[PDB]
Amino acid sequence: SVDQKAISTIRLLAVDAVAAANSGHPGAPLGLAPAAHAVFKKMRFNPKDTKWINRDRFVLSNGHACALLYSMLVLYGYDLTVEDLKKFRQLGSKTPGHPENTDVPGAEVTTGPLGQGICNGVGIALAQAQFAATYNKPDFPISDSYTYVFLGDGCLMEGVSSEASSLAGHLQLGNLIAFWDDNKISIDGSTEVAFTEDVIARYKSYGWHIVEVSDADTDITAIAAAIDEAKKVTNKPTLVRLTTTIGFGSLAQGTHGVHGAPLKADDIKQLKTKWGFNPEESFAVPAEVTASYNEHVAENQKIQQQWNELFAAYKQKYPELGAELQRRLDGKLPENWDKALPVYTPADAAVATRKLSEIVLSKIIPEVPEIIGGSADLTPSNLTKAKGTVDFQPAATGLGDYSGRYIRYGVREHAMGAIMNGIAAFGANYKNYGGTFLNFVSYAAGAVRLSALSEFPITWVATHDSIGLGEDGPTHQPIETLAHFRATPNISVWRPADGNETSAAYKSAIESTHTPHILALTRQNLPQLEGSSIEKASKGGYTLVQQDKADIIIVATGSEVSLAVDALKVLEGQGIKAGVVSLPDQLTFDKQSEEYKLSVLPDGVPILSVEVMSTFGWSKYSHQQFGLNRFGASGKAPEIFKLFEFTPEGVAERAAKTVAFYKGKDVVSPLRSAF
Amino acid sequence: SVDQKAISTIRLLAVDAVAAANSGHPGAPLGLAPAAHAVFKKMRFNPKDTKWINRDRFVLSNGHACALLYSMLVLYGYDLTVEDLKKFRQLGSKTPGHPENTDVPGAEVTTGPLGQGICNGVGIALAQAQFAATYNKPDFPISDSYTYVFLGDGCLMEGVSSEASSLAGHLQLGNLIAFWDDNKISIDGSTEVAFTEDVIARYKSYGWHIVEVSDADTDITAIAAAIDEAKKVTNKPTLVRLTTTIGFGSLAQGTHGVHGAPLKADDIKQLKTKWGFNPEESFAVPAEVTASYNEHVAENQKIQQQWNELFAAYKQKYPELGAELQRRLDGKLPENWDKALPVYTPADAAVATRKLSEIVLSKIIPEVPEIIGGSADLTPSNLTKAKGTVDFQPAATGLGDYSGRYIRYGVREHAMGAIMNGIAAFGANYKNYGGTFLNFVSYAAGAVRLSALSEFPITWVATHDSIGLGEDGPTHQPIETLAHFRATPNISVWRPADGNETSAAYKSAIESTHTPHILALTRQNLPQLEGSSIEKASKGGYTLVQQDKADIIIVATGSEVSLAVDALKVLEGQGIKAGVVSLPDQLTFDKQSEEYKLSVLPDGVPILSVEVMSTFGWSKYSHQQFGLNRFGASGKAPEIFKLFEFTPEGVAERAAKTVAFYKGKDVVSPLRSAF
Ligand SMILES: Cc1ncc(C[n+]2csc(CCOP(=O)(O)OP(=O)(O)O)c2C)c(N)n1
Ligand SMILES: Cc1ncc(C[n+]2csc(CCOP(=O)(O)OP(=O)(O)O)c2C)c(N)n1
Ligand SMILES: O=P(O)(O)OC[C@H]1O[C@H](O)[C@H](O)[C@@H]1O
Ligand SMILES: O=P(O)(O)OC[C@H]1O[C@H](O)[C@H](O)[C@@H]1O
Ligand SMILES: [Ca+2]
Numbered sequence A, B: 001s002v003d004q005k006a007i008s009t010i011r012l013l014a015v016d017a018v019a020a021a022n023s024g025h026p027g028a029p030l031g032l033a034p035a036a037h038a039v040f041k042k043m044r045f046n047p048k049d050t051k052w053i054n055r056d057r058f059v060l061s062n063g064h065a066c067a068l069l070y071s072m073l074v075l076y077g078y079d080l081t082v083e084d085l086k087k088f089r090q091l092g093s094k095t096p097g098h099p100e101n102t103d104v105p106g107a108e109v110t111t112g113p114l115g116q117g118i119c120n121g122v123g124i125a126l127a128q129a130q131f132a133a134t135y136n137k138p139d140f141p142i143s144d145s146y147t148y149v150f151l152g153d154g155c156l157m158e159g160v161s162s163e164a165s166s167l168a169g170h171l172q173l174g175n176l177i178a179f180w181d182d183n184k185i186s187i188d189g190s191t192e193v194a195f196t197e198d199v200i201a202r203y204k205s206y207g208w209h210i211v212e213v214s215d216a217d218t219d220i221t222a223i224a225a226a227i228d229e230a231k232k233v234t235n236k237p238t239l240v241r242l243t244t245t246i247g248f249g250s251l252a253q254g255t256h257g258v259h260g261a262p263l264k265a266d267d268i269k270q271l272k273t274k275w276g277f278n279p280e281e282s283f284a285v286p287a288e289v290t291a292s293y294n295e296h297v298a299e300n301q302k303i304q305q306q307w308n309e310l311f312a313a314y315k316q317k318y319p320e321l322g323a324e325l326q327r328r329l330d331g332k333l334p335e336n337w338d339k340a341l342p343v344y345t346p347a348d349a350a351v352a353t354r355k356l357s358e359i360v361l362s363k364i365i366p367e368v369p370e371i372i373g374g375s376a377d378l379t380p381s382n383l384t385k386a387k388g389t390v391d392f393q394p395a396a397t398g399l400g401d402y403s404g405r406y407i408r409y410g411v412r413e414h415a416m417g418a419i420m421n422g423i424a425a426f427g428a429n430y431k432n433y434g435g436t437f438l439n440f441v442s443y444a445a446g447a448v449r450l451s452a453l454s455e456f457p458i459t460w461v462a463t464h465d466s467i468g469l470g471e472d473g474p475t476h477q478p479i480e481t482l483a484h485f486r487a488t489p490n491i492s493v494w495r496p497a498d499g500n501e502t503s504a505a506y507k508s509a510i511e512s513t514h515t516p517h518i519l520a521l522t523r524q525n526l527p528q529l530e531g532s533s534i535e536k537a538s539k540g541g542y543t544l545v546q547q548d549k550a551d552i553i554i555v556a557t558g559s560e561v562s563l564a565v566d567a568l569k570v571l572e573g574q575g576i577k578a579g580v581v582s583l584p585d586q587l588t589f590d591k592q593s594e595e596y597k598l599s600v601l602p603d604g605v606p607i608l609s610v611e612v613m614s615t616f617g618w619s620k621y622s623h624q625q626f627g628l629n630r631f632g633a634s635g636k637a638p639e640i641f642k643l644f645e646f647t648p649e650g651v652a653e654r655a656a657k658t659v660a661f662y663k664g665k666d667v668v669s670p671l672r673s674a675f
């Protein structure tokens, strides 16, 4: 049949791609080709419009199997060709060894790090439910799409998927349909060696619906029926158990050897002949298969055409919502939304930057409907919920509604991070955030790094940033955390000092389209600074206190800017003139012009950095660094600052030593380099 | 009764400690006091010998509840007093806001970051089973101890606990007995808002035994009986569901408000009067309670006395095993064990450092019985199993035995990290390791940081360290990873260049008693270096190529040392004389004398670093840094190195630019500083 020919075509494209690269993973593509064929036949999508907002989404959580995904995209006429398949895993190609959303048309997210994709799918489904609740009206199903996810045993072993699956079941996300590749093989061999849990029983315990397909090597009728069944269960996410043979068809099927290396050439020959293909030919695409797939594309394009007319009619019937929806689909924030950002003067009271963050959110959430977010069980500590908003919950619970804007993530930082990536991936201009203590953003590093690589504008509201949190002690106090994330490409790490800087940090975070943000915020109160503004802080780094005859410039962030200002006064009594630079985001600063940066960190003057955590990175901006390179302590915060000499006098002492160290020396800006 | 008085004493000590600090968590201590009383009465321990190897272990995974733990330790006469309780959460005290094994007598591990403790308990239990299988003989139950863990809803939400619980069930760890504080409250309020899964059904799906105690506020008879029942189930870990009221007894019991802030003074008064205590008195310890607890200590000390005689008799009956056991309990490695480390010459073949690591393990595992370890489903890629060894599995499976030495962790990096901490915490000189790709050590950051804070000598075998891995691409290629861990206090991050350096890295890792190790190892082959040795590499940094008239010194690690040596030859043709420094571990180097360090990185010469990942930290050792501060690429590894100009010519160009940049300048060692 044509369906059988399509499945063979998919299998052999994937195998041939791996063969050409002499690298990659043929096993899961061989095992999952029937399911991929069946799922894509049920999906609504336009290969010529990858951003249609009512498309079904597909996520390959077992991203090593990407030769399968690329084969589907090629067969369906996405902007990816057989010539691209021939360049699988080759430098600069459109077919990298794991799928990257920035590079691969039809890759919704970046997968390969196990466990992430299923969580991303939870986030796509969460966003779809919130979006539909916000916009759908009687006779106007603006959003009614599904989220289909493939995942393997490795994803099921990774704790992040447990977190997201518990939460998805709680949230009754009925438009999520996941498929477990139940092939009983991982890299170390049989799953009997390490993974003997009853997966199905676990998923039932989360409140998921289950469908089992006992012969997923051949039974596409049952896979299609499983999808139909899942669609009828509107209040539970569904897990479809696909019992497959890894490497189905290979001489080496059902073995770990078929997981992650190219097949032998003789094996590929016998695959081709058993399935009616020419063993002398590679990258065959039978015209029957193209025709069948094209029929499905044409039908999907007519569905999108009708959706476009539905949307036009929606804009007439619901003028205000229609304009809002249009704006969001155009990727534009509300005009002058930023006029809602709070502004402060030096006469205003001292405030913790966690509380300043609460106040920002309180003002901007009503102004910008595409902002949603939550906390990982730290809502009253991170201060991440705007008073008067409703939680995102299924209405059946009585605890919220899908139109809600505040997500109770529970104690699930890693899944929160990956779910945020999924919400961003949904599109529609979602600007979403997640709160935890800065030290526990580290629990989510797997996902955070992918926010950066995937270029998603997600935001971490990361409070309790330092030893300033006090008594909870060294298990809670960041040391390495900012260095880690600043050393990751494409992460803005804002550490605002005061009210105006906190508003600049949010302006950046919400306006972002390609760069994730971490906002490092304080437990303790900080004064409003003389010289701060949204305008200046928006440059990432700026001259707070200009001193034309400076003996030294002190560069600082966050809670240490006020400390630097106080140290300036101590230094004046010692006959030393200091300037102060505030550096609320190193990435934003780095992106400014060379001349702007040199106006902040000029030649001819020693520069001392002050920040109460690792000194790593700080030599980019300073000659000497005063930081904290040991773990913290459990005590009242001011006593910890005193212990480590982060006091006006301690900073002044190190500033005076720095001035003395450079006496008789020629000093150029830390911004200078040899190459 | 005396038991009722003990429970009230525990509750009120905990409440009074929080009150004195005006900080901390009274709710879970109030709810768990009955269970703590019951468990400690069943436990065998010696307050005067915290390291007795056959003690039962207790772990407080919900570490915020530590006022409870400290109260138990005080009541039982550990080296912790009521005066220490009065200094709860105060700078420098023995009663920090979360328990720290380095500081608190009777704290087996450091908890507070949720999810970690239960995983640590899995590791303690894994070690106990391996230890017992290794040493026990007929009539010689050298090891027969239990591992008791308290955990809350937060630990159950964290994915790391799912990973460890799946694995513990697979491993049939019958001496693990965990207790869930089922109080239906977390920081964000009712667990109904975020955590509605059927926990018990999930634990059954992992192969755990369950006991439910419906009134754990009062029913210590049922809690004791649950322990007895758990002890009869020898092939399953047990979860005991303790249905409690958070803050039991408080006016605010059963609310989130009682979780994490001090009680009101009037609330504490009514607690005291309801329980027969003086509301005017704080830190009361009724002498009846002390007497009852002392009886249990005296009985436990007689048990340890008899164990000591058993051990003496064991050494007579089993002379070889007895001497081995003695040596391990003395904390000493075998005499001259390091003579088994492989040594190489520059005439030997090029080898990947992952393969050199395999070879080291193959030689030292037979020599050093206290080495055990595993991989997170990457055994044939990390090369972490010595041929001929048996896996750690329950014999019932036929897949291994508890005497085995190789652990199949599955795709569970975070739990692997926390389990390693538990194995180290068991003691008996265990030197344990865990393999994954370096980029996915980041999944385990929560645990890795605790290895450092807890001072545990665990080892990560972290292969595929860079763009050198090639085709798997940027989702797999570390950039930020070494900077992150080097910026964490107390982590040795070894990046060996060749065979001799790899042996030095293992010598350090195995000899360690207080410092975790990460060994960053290559996929690709590297040459044996002229000038390397175990002796020199053991210093962390050393002069590989000395050049008395150097125009520049190139400092490098790992795969980039050979690159630097090749660049030296290119520079010679340009009339530039270079020296080369190899810096296999920055922490070990930093610990050398100032004079030694200056012999490696002298004044008066420009120094260029070369390492194919983040430049963060490198200014400690260099004036200019050539690194990789963007994500990688999917392609053949040599082509990626060429793309980013990590070639002999690219290094030479930057070296020549560095020499030119410092012409006419006075250059001092990067090791110099102003303070
Ligand atoms: C977080 C993470 N850890 C480790 C790996 C390395 N890795 C790639 S695939 C795989 C396991 C393969 O098992 P499974 O998901 O069952 O895939 P299948 O063998 O069925 O193809 C591992 C451990 C990874 N990609 N991501
Ligand atoms: C990894 C991590 N994330 C977040 C926190 C902050 N935190 C401390 S206790 C807690 C939750 C309390 O819930 P539970 O464990 O049920 O404790 P109980 O309220 O019953 O005392 C949270 C989120 C933490 N300590 N560790
Ligand atoms: O005063 P906050 O810092 O907001 O919160 C106090 C504690 O309450 C919660 O357990 C938090 O995790 C803290 O440990
Ligand atoms: O050749 P190796 O790098 O050891 O392993 C090749 C692949 O096989 C496994 O999926 C690994 O995770 C890799 O992606
Ligand atoms: Ca599998």
Ligand SMILES: [Ca+2]
Residues within 6 Å of the ligand: B152, B153, B154, B181, B183, B184, B185, B186
């Ligand atoms: Ca709880």
